Ligand binder design. Sequence first.
Ligand code: ZN
Ligand code: ZN
Lengths: 200, 200
Amino acid sequence: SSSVPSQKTYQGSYGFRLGFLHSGTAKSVTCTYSPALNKMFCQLAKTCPVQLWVDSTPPPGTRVRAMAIYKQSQHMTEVVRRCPHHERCSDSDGLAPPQHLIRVEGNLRVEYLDDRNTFRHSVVVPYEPPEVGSDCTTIHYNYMCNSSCMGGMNRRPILTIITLEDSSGNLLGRNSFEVRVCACPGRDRRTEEENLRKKG
Amino acid sequence: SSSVPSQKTYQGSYGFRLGFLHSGTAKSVTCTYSPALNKMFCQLAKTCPVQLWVDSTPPPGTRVRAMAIYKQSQHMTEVVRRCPHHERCSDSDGLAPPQHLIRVEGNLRVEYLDDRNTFRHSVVVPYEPPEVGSDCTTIHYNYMCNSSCMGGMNRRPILTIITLEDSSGNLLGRNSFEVRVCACPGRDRRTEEENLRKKG
DNA sequence: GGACATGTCC
DNA sequence: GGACATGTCC
Ligand SMILES: [Zn+2]
Ligand SMILES: [Zn+2]
């Protein structure tokens, strides 16, 4: 069995997809999303709102997991972790282990997990349906290193894989998106989309 | 008493001064020295030959200490250390503590010291006079982080202070030089000397 | 070695 | 935000 989680999109029976806020790139903003690249550009430890959309309501006890993997085949097998510098920075919120790249803020039932076999990190919260009048649920993620962090992601792109899972562990839905954590999300999104057009 | 070692040049009664190899900058070389800037440019963990010159022979038991401090007044008080990434890299040679920035290679009597009061690191070897026919003694230093290392020197310039000390601890001589540890010593020396001329 | 990268200065 | 920085790609 593979030690690398599938990144394969699975809309599933509940019509699961992700949504992202608009947009830009007015200024080198804190967080911006490129539909063309399927890529979030954001800043170190800043809020990244991700929306969960479903057509049919998941059953009670459904959970939402986020996990990072390296996007490139050459790096897929390596566990995505915080670099040694940021790991020792004591910026923990009391819940997140200092090694974990991805945090969820503002959730009283967050769980941080480390796979006993793959050693990969993930963070889980309960799924909750939208309030009446709302079409989605929003989770605030934080990425606790820059993509460029020496001894950590080291300039390698990652994907965040979001899985919708029932109590029993059945996969109900899966989506994923590329992430670049950088100093200037607005600038870098512009640069990448222009290189896509010209050279892609 | 100051927790910051003096960088004040002291040629002393023995006529102590430093010498550096020539030069460049043919290519982005591994190690190059700028007389105008009093600055060594070198690469991570590569050999940096430093020559010790004296007019009168130091007495037996004389020692040679190297220590780094931040050059800028704003950073002088902070101890110069390896970054967390390089510290944990297990590149130790069996003698140097993994936190120490400055190593001496090729010396059977090297001592690595940490000041009980200032916590500053230094590395010491016995002073030895030149062989007959030679005008100097050469020590091979290594700098085990780049100047840019996140969580370490963090792009701040350092000075290396070389002290000639007798057995008893008397200061016989002192010299110092700025260091930039970088990927492209040749390129950066050229850039800095040109900015000195134009803007200095 | 030239171009590109990507965090920082101002 | 433009210029500069500084490690990396090729
Ligand atoms: Zn980091
Ligand atoms: Zn380092």
